[PDB]
Paper text:
A tetratricopeptide repeat (TPR) motif containing mitochondrial outer membrane protein, mitochondrial fission protein 1 (Fis1), mediates mitochondrial fission by recruiting large cytosolic GTPase, Drp1, to the mitochondrial outer membrane. The cytosolic domain of Fis1 is composed of 6 tight α-helices with two anti-parallel TPR motifs forming a concave hydrophobic surface. Fis1 interaction with Drp1 occurs during cellular stress, but not under physiological conditions, suggesting that cellular signals during stress activate Fis1. Human Fis1 protein contains a single cysteine, Cys41, in the entire protein.
To explore this possibility further, we crystallized and determined the X-ray structures of the WT and three phosphorylation mimic-mutants of Fis1: Thr34Asp Fis1, Thr34Glu Fis1 and Tyr38Glu Fis1. Each of these mutants was previously shown to be sufficient to increase Drp1 recruitment to mitochondria and subsequent mitochondrial fission in cell-based studies. Consistently, we observed that the first 30 residues including the α1 helix were missing from the structure providing strong evidence that the α1 helix undergoes significant conformational change and is potentially disordered in the phosphorylated forms, whereas it was intact in the WT. We crystallized the phosphorylation-mimic mutants, Thr34Asp, Thr34Glu and Tyr38Glu Fis1, and we observed that in all the cases, these mutants crystallized as covalent dimers mediated by Cys41 disulfide bridge between two Fis1 protomers. As Thr34Asp, Thr34Glu and Tyr38Glu Fis1 have a greater propensity for a conformationally altered N-terminus and hence have more exposed Cys41, they crystallized as covalent dimers. Upon closer examination of the crystal structures, we observed that the concave hydrophobic surface in the covalent dimers of all the phosphorylation-mimic mutants was exposed. Our crystal structure not only shows the absence of α1 helix but also shows that there is no space for structured α1 helix in the covalent dimer as this space is occupied by α2 helix of another monomer. Here we showed that Cys41 is also oxidizable and mediates Fis1 covalent dimerization through disulfide linkage. This oxidation-induced Fis1 dimerization was obvious in the crystal structures of Thr34Asp, Thr34Glu and Tyr38Glu Fis1, where we saw a clear electron density for the disulfide linkage. When we modeled the structure of Fis1 WT dimer using the Thr34Asp Fis1 covalent dimer with modeled the missing unstructured first 30 residues, the Fis1 covalent WT dimer perfectly fitted the SAXS curve for WT Fis1 dimer.
Author numbering:
A (entry chain A), B (entry chain A): 31 to 129
Amino acid sequence: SKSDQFEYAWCLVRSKYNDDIRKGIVLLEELLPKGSKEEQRDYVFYLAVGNYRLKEYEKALKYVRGLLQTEPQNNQAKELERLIDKAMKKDGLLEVLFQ
Amino acid sequence: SKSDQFEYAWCLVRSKYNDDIRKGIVLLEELLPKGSKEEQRDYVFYLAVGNYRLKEYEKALKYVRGLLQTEPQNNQAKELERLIDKAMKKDGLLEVLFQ
Protein backbone atom coordinates (compact mmCIF):
# COMPACT_ATOMS: atom_id res chain seq x y z
CA SER A 1 0.00 0.00 0.00
CA LYS A 2 1.06 3.63 -0.47
CA SER A 3 0.38 4.98 3.05
CA ASP A 4 2.56 2.15 4.34
CA GLN A 5 5.66 2.58 2.15
CA PHE A 6 5.79 6.13 3.56
CA GLU A 7 5.98 5.00 7.22
CA TYR A 8 8.82 2.62 6.33
CA ALA A 9 10.62 5.40 4.51
CA TRP A 10 9.80 7.81 7.34
CA CYS A 11 11.29 5.47 9.93
CA LEU A 12 14.23 4.94 7.58
CA VAL A 13 15.03 8.64 7.05
CA ARG A 14 14.94 8.95 10.88
CA SER A 15 17.62 6.28 11.43
CA LYS A 16 21.06 6.87 12.89
CA TYR A 17 22.66 4.90 10.03
CA ASN A 18 23.44 6.56 6.72
CA ASP A 19 22.60 3.44 4.68
CA ASP A 20 19.10 3.33 6.11
CA ILE A 21 18.86 7.00 5.16
CA ARG A 22 19.75 6.40 1.51
CA LYS A 23 17.17 3.63 1.33
CA GLY A 24 14.62 5.86 3.06
CA ILE A 25 15.30 8.46 0.38
CA VAL A 26 15.14 6.24 -2.70
CA LEU A 27 11.77 4.88 -1.56
CA LEU A 28 10.56 8.49 -1.34
CA GLU A 29 11.80 9.25 -4.85
CA GLU A 30 9.86 6.28 -6.23
CA LEU A 31 6.90 7.43 -4.11
CA LEU A 32 7.03 10.97 -5.53
CA PRO A 33 5.20 10.38 -8.89
CA LYS A 34 2.53 8.21 -7.23
CA GLY A 35 1.65 11.15 -5.01
CA SER A 36 -1.31 13.39 -4.42
CA LYS A 37 -0.97 17.18 -4.45
CA GLU A 38 -0.30 17.41 -0.73
CA GLU A 39 1.21 13.93 -0.47
CA GLN A 40 3.99 15.27 -2.70
CA ARG A 41 4.37 18.40 -0.58
CA ASP A 42 5.05 16.01 2.28
CA TYR A 43 7.45 13.70 0.42
CA VAL A 44 9.49 16.68 -0.83
CA PHE A 45 9.83 18.03 2.67
CA TYR A 46 11.11 14.66 3.87
CA LEU A 47 13.59 14.28 1.01
CA ALA A 48 15.08 17.60 2.12
CA VAL A 49 15.38 16.38 5.70
CA GLY A 50 17.09 13.19 4.53
CA ASN A 51 19.50 14.84 2.09
CA TYR A 52 20.26 17.40 4.80
CA ARG A 53 21.20 14.66 7.26
CA LEU A 54 23.62 13.19 4.67
CA LYS A 55 25.35 16.60 4.24
CA GLU A 56 23.96 16.58 0.66
CA TYR A 57 23.17 20.22 1.33
CA GLU A 58 22.91 21.19 -2.33
CA LYS A 59 20.21 18.65 -3.21
CA ALA A 60 18.37 19.38 0.05
CA LEU A 61 18.04 23.08 -0.83
CA LYS A 62 16.72 22.25 -4.32
CA TYR A 63 13.81 20.45 -2.65
CA VAL A 64 13.05 22.89 0.17
CA ARG A 65 13.25 25.66 -2.45
CA GLY A 66 10.89 23.97 -4.92
CA LEU A 67 8.39 23.42 -2.11
CA LEU A 68 8.79 27.04 -0.99
CA GLN A 69 7.61 28.52 -4.31
CA THR A 70 4.54 26.32 -4.09
CA GLU A 71 4.08 27.10 -0.36
CA PRO A 72 5.79 30.46 0.36
CA GLN A 73 4.55 30.55 3.94
CA ASN A 74 5.19 26.99 5.16
CA ASN A 75 7.21 28.11 8.19
CA GLN A 76 8.29 24.50 8.69
CA ALA A 77 9.80 24.63 5.21
CA LYS A 78 11.16 28.11 5.90
CA GLU A 79 12.87 26.80 9.06
CA LEU A 80 14.33 23.80 7.23
CA GLU A 81 15.81 26.16 4.63
CA ARG A 82 17.11 28.24 7.51
CA LEU A 83 18.99 25.22 8.90
CA ILE A 84 20.34 24.24 5.50
CA ASP A 85 21.94 27.64 4.92
CA LYS A 86 23.71 27.61 8.30
CA ALA A 87 25.17 24.14 7.75
CA MET A 88 26.36 25.43 4.37
CA LYS A 89 27.86 28.67 5.67
CA LYS A 90 29.76 26.82 8.38
CA ASP A 91 30.86 24.15 5.87
CA GLY A 92 32.35 26.69 3.47
CA LEU A 93 34.18 28.30 6.36
CA LEU A 94 35.86 25.01 7.25
CA GLU A 95 36.46 24.46 3.54
CA VAL A 96 38.78 27.48 3.17
CA LEU A 97 40.19 27.46 6.69
CA PHE A 98 43.68 26.91 5.24
CA GLN A 99 43.24 29.24 2.24
CA SER B 1 3.60 -9.81 3.89
CA LYS B 2 5.58 -11.38 6.74
CA SER B 3 9.14 -10.78 5.48
CA ASP B 4 8.20 -7.11 5.15
CA GLN B 5 6.71 -6.45 8.61
CA PHE B 6 10.10 -7.62 9.94
CA GLU B 7 12.12 -4.99 8.02
CA TYR B 8 9.80 -2.27 9.31
CA ALA B 9 10.19 -3.57 12.84
CA TRP B 10 13.92 -4.00 12.29
CA CYS B 11 14.30 -0.40 11.16
CA LEU B 12 12.08 0.62 14.07
CA VAL B 13 14.07 -1.19 16.78
CA ARG B 14 17.16 0.54 15.31
CA SER B 15 15.75 4.06 15.74
CA LYS B 16 17.12 6.72 18.05
CA TYR B 17 13.62 7.40 19.42
CA ASN B 18 12.18 5.30 22.22
CA ASP B 19 8.62 5.44 20.82
CA ASP B 20 9.75 3.95 17.53
CA ILE B 21 11.44 1.26 19.62
CA ARG B 22 8.26 0.31 21.48
CA LYS B 23 6.40 0.07 18.18
CA GLY B 24 9.25 -1.95 16.69
CA ILE B 25 8.90 -4.33 19.62
CA VAL B 26 5.13 -4.77 19.63
CA LEU B 27 5.22 -5.63 15.92
CA LEU B 28 7.78 -8.33 16.76
CA GLU B 29 5.58 -9.73 19.52
CA GLU B 30 2.66 -10.05 17.10
CA LEU B 31 5.12 -11.54 14.59
CA LEU B 32 6.35 -14.16 17.07
CA PRO B 33 3.49 -16.75 16.76
CA LYS B 34 3.42 -16.44 12.95
CA GLY B 35 7.05 -17.51 12.89
CA SER B 36 9.06 -20.39 11.56
CA LYS B 37 11.50 -22.30 13.76
CA GLU B 38 14.44 -20.08 12.87
CA GLU B 39 12.31 -17.03 12.12
CA GLN B 40 11.41 -17.10 15.82
CA ARG B 41 15.05 -17.51 16.84
CA ASP B 42 15.62 -14.27 14.96
CA TYR B 43 12.63 -12.36 16.35
CA VAL B 44 13.56 -13.33 19.93
CA PHE B 45 17.08 -12.07 19.45
CA TYR B 46 15.73 -8.74 18.20
CA LEU B 47 13.24 -8.37 21.05
CA ALA B 48 16.20 -8.68 23.42
CA VAL B 49 18.10 -5.96 21.56
CA GLY B 50 15.06 -3.67 21.70
CA ASN B 51 14.22 -4.26 25.36
CA TYR B 52 17.92 -3.81 26.14
CA ARG B 53 17.96 -0.41 24.44
CA LEU B 54 14.96 0.67 26.58
CA LYS B 55 16.80 -0.32 29.80
CA GLU B 56 14.13 -3.05 30.20
CA TYR B 57 17.05 -5.25 31.20
CA GLU B 58 14.92 -7.84 33.00
CA LYS B 59 12.69 -8.63 30.01
CA ALA B 60 15.69 -8.58 27.67
CA LEU B 61 17.45 -11.30 29.67
CA LYS B 62 14.32 -13.50 29.67
CA TYR B 63 14.51 -13.54 25.87
CA VAL B 64 18.25 -13.95 25.39
CA ARG B 65 18.08 -16.70 28.03
CA GLY B 66 15.19 -18.57 26.39
CA LEU B 67 17.03 -18.46 23.07
CA LEU B 68 20.24 -19.65 24.77
CA GLN B 69 18.73 -22.94 25.99
CA THR B 70 17.57 -23.60 22.45
CA GLU B 71 20.91 -22.43 20.98
CA PRO B 72 23.60 -22.82 23.70
CA GLN B 73 26.40 -21.85 21.34
CA ASN B 74 24.97 -18.83 19.50
CA ASN B 75 27.92 -16.58 20.37
CA GLN B 76 25.91 -13.61 19.13
CA ALA B 77 23.31 -14.47 21.77
CA LYS B 78 26.06 -15.16 24.29
CA GLU B 79 27.53 -11.70 23.62
CA LEU B 80 24.14 -10.01 23.93
CA GLU B 81 23.67 -11.69 27.32
CA ARG B 82 27.17 -10.52 28.20
CA LEU B 83 26.18 -6.90 27.50
CA ILE B 84 22.92 -7.21 29.41
CA ASP B 85 24.65 -8.36 32.60
CA LYS B 86 27.13 -5.46 32.54
CA ALA B 87 24.39 -2.84 32.09
CA MET B 88 22.64 -4.52 35.04
CA LYS B 89 25.69 -4.68 37.30
CA LYS B 90 26.47 -1.02 36.67
CA ASP B 91 22.79 -0.09 37.16
CA GLY B 92 22.58 -1.77 40.57
CA LEU B 93 25.76 0.02 41.60
CA LEU B 94 24.22 3.41 40.82
CA GLU B 95 21.04 2.20 42.52
CA VAL B 96 22.66 1.85 45.96
CA LEU B 97 25.25 4.58 45.57
CA PHE B 98 23.68 6.43 48.52
CA GLN B 99 22.96 3.31 50.61
